[PDB]
Amino acid sequence: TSILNLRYESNHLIDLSRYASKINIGSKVNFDPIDKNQIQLFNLESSKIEVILKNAIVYNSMYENFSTSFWIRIPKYFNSISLNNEYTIINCMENNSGWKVSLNYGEIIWTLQDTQEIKQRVVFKYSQMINISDYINRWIFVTITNNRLNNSKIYINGRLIDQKPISNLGNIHASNNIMFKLDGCRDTHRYIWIKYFNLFDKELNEKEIKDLYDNQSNSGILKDFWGDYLQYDKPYYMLNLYDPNKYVDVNNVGIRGYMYLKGPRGSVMTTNIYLNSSLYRGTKFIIKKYASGNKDNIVRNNDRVYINVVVKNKEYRLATNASQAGVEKILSALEIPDVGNLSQVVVMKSKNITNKCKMNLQDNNGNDIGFIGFHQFNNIAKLVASNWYNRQIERSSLGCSWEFIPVDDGWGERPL
Length: 416
What we know:
Layout: E1 4-8, E2 13-15, E3 22-25, E4 30-31, E5 39-42, E6 49-52, E7 60-61, E8 66-73, E9 87-93, E10 98-104, E11 107-113, E12 119-125, E13 140-146, E14 151-156, E15 159-165, E16 172-173, E17 177-183, E18 191-200, H1 206-215, E19 237-240, E20 247-250, E21 259-262, E22 267-270, E23 274-277, E24 285-289, E25 304-310, E26 315-319, E27 329-330, E28 332-334, E29 345-351, E30 354-362, E31 368-377, E32 380-386, H2 387-394, E33 402-405
Region (C-terminus of receptor binding domain (C-RBD)): 218-416
Organism: Clostridium botulinum
Membrane topology: Multi-pass membrane protein
C-alpha cells in the first residue's frame, strides 16, 4: 500500500511498489551479507543511495497527507565534535521546500518547510547518560506521519513521541528525488545502518503503525541486543533483564560448581558525552546447533540448541541434573566430554506475543525442565531452570528474559 517500498530483492536494491522508482547506489555503500536489506552509509561522498521518484508521486501540495517509516541503528556518539551538529541523512528538499530526516547528538529530527520559508520540526530525543538504553546503537523503528490540517508526529517503536502543528504551512513542493546520505556531519567516522524504507500517501494511524512495526520485526527470528539476527557459533556477553547490573560468571567448572549472576557491572564513559553500564562482562555464551540439517546460522523461534559457556578461553556445556531436590535446577558448566545424560537441550524462544530471548531447558525425552533464569541461594543469584517460570506464563505474563550481546563497533567499549 506504500508508494515507495525499498527492498533488496534478487540481487538488487529496488522499489517493490507499482511505481518501481529508480534507485542509484553509490560505490561506497555497504550491504550486510547476512541480510542485504540492512544498509550502512558512511560519512563519504560516495556512500549514498538516490531514489528517482516517478512524477506521479512527487510531493507538491497544500493538503495531501503522507507518512514515512524505516528502521535505523545509530552508533553511540563518541566525540564532542558531534555536539551541536545536526546532519541530514534522508533528504527530499528541492529548493528550500520539502522534507528531510536529520540526526544530531541524541536525537532524530523531522523537518518540513513550505515554499514560503515556513517550517516545523518534530524531534525524538534520547539520552547517552543512561545505564542501559533501548535506543543507542540498537535497531529502532521510526514512523513519521503528516496531516496537513493539523500536525506532524514522530513515533519510535510504534509509540508516539512528539507532535507539532503544521497547519500554518502552505504549499510544500518536495524534490523529485530522495537522497540517503550523511550531509553536514563533522564526525569523519560517523555512519548509520538503515533498512525497510517506505513512503505512504496518507497519515498512518496508530493501528497501522503498530502492525507495520510487528510485521517488520521478523518475530520468528531471535535477535541479539543490537537487534540483528541472533546467530549460532557467535560469542555473546549475557544480560539478564531482571537485574541488568550483574553479569554471568562461573564458580567452578563441573557438576559440583555452578553459574551465577555477579556483582556490579562495570561502567563506560567519556566526559560530557556518555556514561553507560559496561556490556562486555562475564562469561560468554555460544549457541550450538542441536540438528545440522539447516545450513544457515540464524537462530529461530523454536530451535533446539546447546549452550556453550566460555571460561578462560575454553568451552564448556551448560547443563544440570534434573534429579536435584527442588523445582529450581541449579545450572553448571560441564566438561563437554562428560555431560553424559545430563539435561542440556535448550529450546530458544522469541515469541509465544513477542518477547525478549528466552531459553527453555528440556531433558533428553523432550520434557520441560524450565525456562532459564536465576534464584537466590545463600545470598547468591545462581542460574537455574525452573518450570515455575513456564507455569507463571502459562497463567498470564522477568528473571527468565535474556539479552545476548556481541561486540559491536557502534558501542565502542573495549573488552577484556
